[PDB]
Amino acid sequence: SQIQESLTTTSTALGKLQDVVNQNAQALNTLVKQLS
Amino acid sequence: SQIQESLTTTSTALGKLQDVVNQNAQALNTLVKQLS
Amino acid sequence: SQIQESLTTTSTALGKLQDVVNQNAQALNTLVKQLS
Amino acid sequence: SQIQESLTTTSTALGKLQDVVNQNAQALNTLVKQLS
Amino acid sequence: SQIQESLTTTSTALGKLQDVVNQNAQALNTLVKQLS
Amino acid sequence: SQIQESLTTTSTALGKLQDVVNQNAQALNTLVKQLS
Amino acid sequence: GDISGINASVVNIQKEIDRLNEVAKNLNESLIDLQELGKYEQYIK
Amino acid sequence: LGDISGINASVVNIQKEIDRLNEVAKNLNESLIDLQELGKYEQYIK
Amino acid sequence: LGDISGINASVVNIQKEIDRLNEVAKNLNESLIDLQELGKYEQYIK
Amino acid sequence: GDISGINASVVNIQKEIDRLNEVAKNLNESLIDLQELGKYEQYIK
Amino acid sequence: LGDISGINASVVNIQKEIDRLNEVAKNLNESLIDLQELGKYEQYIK
Amino acid sequence: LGDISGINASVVNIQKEIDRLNEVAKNLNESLIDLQELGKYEQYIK
């Protein structure tokens, strides 16, 4: 059950990273769009 | 089995994040160098 | 011992990702501030 | 499997002892009857 | 706990045999005494 | 350890019973043959 | 025979014999040989 | 501003890996020696 | 007096059993897991 | 800058990182490597 | 406009970790006893 | 009656073995892998 919890914990962290990485990619692309 | 799969799945996910984070870091530094 | 190591390797990797993601958010936010 | 075998070997030995002890009680009782 | 029970079970059987073997030895010796 | 000791203890006890039962069987048969 | 009173006793350890056999029959539900489990798992994997 | 319109940030997609980890977490008993695996052992050893 | 010529005491023969116990003892694989005791885990770990 | 509104988000997975490390630290109280236990017991006996 | 020359994005390097996960996976000793589950013995055996 | 006065039945004494089996039955945990033995293992493996 400790390993099970560790898998879903890892999953959750990966998801939180994915979300922010993607938000920040969109921000940077919006900035390149506006500046050009 | 399930445990080997969790490890290689985690490794793959980590690698994909590293690639995109670093691609986006390179994009931002190219933007700065251009503007600078 | 193999699962133990996999968990701390995973956590270390996630921590490095968190730090760089946040440092790059800082860089993008600073850039926006300086330009606007 | 070694403990299993030791238990049935023990029980078999005890059963053989019970039977002979009782057969010899019979022999002694019969002898007493015949002589008295 | 099954092995523990089996040890005390064996002990009890051995004791019951000892008791009867010894009673019957005394009976036989009493008979040899009386007849001689 | 304790389990090896239980086995050899049981074997010893069984052997001692076999010896006395058989000695007493021989005594009874000698008595019968004499009387007969 | 002033000997008519001499008697041999009988023994009954059948309950004990039976109980040993019942313990033996069912022992695998509660006791595992570590070495044998290890070898089985090595074969399966 | 010229010289920057081609700069592009990529997006990541690890949804399959995220989902797979949650899937595997439910079925970890096939990777462990629990009481059911000992039952399979017991059948072997008789 | 009754006929006594046919009265005979039996001899026990449990040598094979005695010997087998000694054999098994000499060869004993001592590493037995007590599943009843490991069932006490939740108590032990507290 | 009609760009002043652009912002980068920050992440916080510290609870998750910490929890992985805590699981790791204490894993030996609940998970036993059969092969390693077998070898230890072989040495002791 | 403020100075932007000193703004730099950091690069992540988790290759050793990625590689170590792959290493351990390849070498995995799968035979793990789940002591929490074996603690359920009294229930299982009924 | 002559020719029989020397006939003698021996008595058995296995009290020590009877007592020893009851003693050993109390201390069987030193022969088994129970939770305390796993604790000694855990100390080794850290």
UniProtKB/Swiss-Prot annotation, chains A, B, C, D, E, F:
It comes from the Viruses. The gene is S. Residues 1-36 are annotated as: Heptad repeat 1. This is Spike protein S2'. Acts as a viral fusion peptide which is unmasked following S2 cleavage occurring upon virus endocytosis.
